[PDB]
């Protein structure tokens, strides 16, 4: 459940979600 080990290094959080949406490109796609 809860991890027994963590990191003491002061890293910033990183969004690792590499899923992309082409909704900002619908101007030259369907509109």
């Amino acid at each position: 459940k809860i991890p027994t080990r963590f990191s003491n290094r002061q890293n910033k959080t990183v969004n690792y979600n590499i899923d992309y949406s082409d909704d900002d490109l619908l101007e030259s796609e369907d509109d």
Partner: protein, 92 residues
């Protein structure tokens, strides 16, 4: 009888992420990474022992190789980790 690092990497993974698995290719990559870091640190410590006319490799040579190869906060956190492991191993 393949002499890998897979079970120890698995135990470390269950320490940091108890409900996350790992594929075979990722395990091979992790084993290659551990072997690469081992040979880098051991080669740097061997060079450090040869530079100082010393016939032995101690924890000081490993510590200096860690501070030479690892950058930034990785270096000092690995030094703290290895130092407290050596302290725990000596006292007991």
């Amino acid at each position: 009888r393949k002499e890998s690092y897979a079970i120890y990497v698995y135990k470390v993974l269950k320490q940091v992420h108890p409900d996350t698995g790992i594929s075979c290719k990722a395990m091979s990559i992790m084993n290659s990474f551990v072997n690469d870091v081992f040979e880098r640190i051991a080669g740097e410590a061997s060079r450090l022992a040869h530079y100082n006319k010393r016939s032995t490799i101690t924890s000081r040579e490993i510590q200096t190789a860690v501070r030479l190869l690892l950058p930034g906060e990785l270096a000092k956190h690995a030094v703290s980790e290895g130092t407290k492991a050596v302290t725990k191993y000596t006292s007991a």
